[PDB]
Design a binder for this molecule. Structure first.
Ligand SMILES: *CC(=O)N1CCC(C(=O)Nc2ccccc2O)CC1
Ligand SMILES: *CC(=O)N1CCC(C(=O)Nc2ccccc2O)CC1
Lengths: 304, 304
């Protein structure tokens, strides 16, 4: 029993982190096979970041300007290319610790682990969600760029995020491993404001299921609702609209607990309207929305 | 910027987890050098756990009854001994992945990472604190016993916890790696109730400092207090008494933010008396007490 915000074990990703230096900028790279992936802004001076022309900046860079270090050992760069907002540094050595891996572009509401790194060295691991506004709420200081987000399916690491940017509001923006930003964000030091950080309704419901499974049941009530009625209340509280697809996804947790999805919607409606009244659910005083249905089933069944 | 509940990277500990089977019980063991550490209750049947005599139960067990498997490969057990509530299984092979390590007994209020495992296989990593009542609030299903808690100091893993027990209230009890339970708990299926789960005041203050560092400042006020005045309020709210030792420990965060510890005590006093009024601090609606001062400095400075 018990229910924790739980990251994937980071060992397989730790084996992939290197240091990338270009001129005076040091950040992190991901070494898979004979390719090191890193943010293209590694080539920018402070001054460049106001209005960088990356193709023009890159012309001034040769292979030997990209210093790649795995631990204490230097890697030889034998090629470099820009794909969208990432650089792919070809090295002469395949990472011997390369796990089975995929590059995947996640949807808003999907969760992943981040291995925060500095100078190619892991500092910590935490669980994130791709927010509906395509930011993530991370922990990233200077030197943390190139840190990646991932899921593990048994032995296959699905890499979904590389860290690039902090917005003035202290939230985070980055790319998939093809170098495409999540959302409308750019690798430019410019006016970029995040949109409405809406709550991921299906994740809140999943987490209410996890609560019931783990003995926290005080918020169950005598009510039901409909998708349309619930969604009127979701709208008012900046919650994502709940779809039949979300209802279908919650089916296994419904079946396990014997609580109809719409009855749990009715619980959530009352929590939104009435607040927590100073009570907690799984040790939280707000409605947690960074557990997916799959996360709840995973943690509640003990998948490895 | 940003501040997350962050576990240590788990790679070094992943390399140490094995499966231990005795009769029909499967749980986890920690393989360091040529010793596998596991909970002695691996030898109990369900029936035994009501009033086990471990010395007597152990007489019926030989080396060949302890099945130890690292991945797909079996380890040969060449000796076994009971130390307090752990078994030490001597194996004929030193774990080649043994990191630098220490066994340390932590104090209440100290934090650590847990690598939740099932059948010797890592499922996830999360951050815990040794509660003032010597429980931890974990996530542990059947098969998770022998999962360990640890801190990392650069390259040296300090192992502080092995998981043994869930109390009827869904909280967790375990041992250090010398097999001594934290608190008054025993490896018996009996009436064991946790005492008052008091809030770790020095950790709350550390986390308020982390909030200010990261831009969350709405709770700073015009007030100060004294240790004695603050402690009257702490008593009423089941907070640990704040000592001059706690004040001294918070000195670096005081210096960095320019906020006197006692002024931050005054902030915390108002939060305790007035509540959050529906506001959040670092995305929480309650006062977080599972970040130590050292954790805040670590995360806010980017140590690896
Ligand atoms: C995220 C990361 O690790 N980065 C991106 C920022 C640079 C950096 O120092 N850039 C910078 C330029 C001009 C003003 C401020 C500022 O942080 C380091 C690597
Ligand atoms: C923590 C862990 O992984 N354990 C401890 C419990 C046993 C187990 O199955 N014991 C048990 C006996 C009788 C009734 C219930 C119950 O869980 C598995 C390993």
């Amino acid at each position: 029993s018990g229910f924790r915000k739980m990251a994937f074990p980071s060992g397989k990703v730790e084996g992939c982190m290197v240091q990338v230096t270009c001129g005076t900028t040091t950040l992190n790279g991901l070494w898979l096979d004979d390719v090191v992936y890193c943010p293209r802004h590694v080539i920018c001076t402070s001054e460049d970041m106001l209005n960088p022309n990356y193709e023009d900046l890159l012309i001034r860079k040769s292979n030997h300007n990209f210093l790649v270090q795995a631990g204490n050992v230097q890697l030889r760069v034998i090629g470099h290319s820009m794909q969208n907002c990432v650089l792919k540094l070809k090295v002469d050595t395949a990472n011997p610790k390369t796990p089975k891996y995929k590059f995947v572009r996640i949807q808003p509401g999907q969760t992943f682990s981040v291995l925060a790194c500095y100078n190619g060295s892991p500092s910590g691991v935490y669980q994130c969600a791709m927010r509906p506004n395509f930011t993530i709420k991370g922990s990233f200081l200077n030197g943390s760029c190139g840190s990646v987000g991932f899921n593990i399916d048994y032995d296959c690491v699905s890499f979904c995020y590389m860290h690039h940017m902090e917005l003035p509001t202290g939230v985070h923006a980055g790319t998939d491993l093809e170098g495409n930003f999540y959302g409308p964000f750019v690798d430019r030091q410019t006016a970029q404001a995040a949109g409405t950080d809406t709550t991921i309704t299906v994740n809140v419901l999943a987490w209410l299921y996890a609560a019931v499974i783990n003995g926290d049941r005080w918020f169950l009530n005598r009510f039901t609702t409909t998708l349309n009625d619930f969604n009127l209340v979701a709208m008012k509280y900046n919650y994502e609209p709940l779809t039949q697809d979300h209802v279908d996804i919650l089916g296994p947790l419904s079946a396990q607990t014997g609580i109809a999805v719409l009855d749990m919607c009715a619980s959530l409606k009352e929590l939104l309207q009435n607040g927590m009244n100073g009570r907690t659910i799984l040790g939280s005083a707000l409605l947690e929305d960074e557990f997916t249905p799959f996360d709840v089933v995973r943690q509640c069944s003990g998948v490895t």
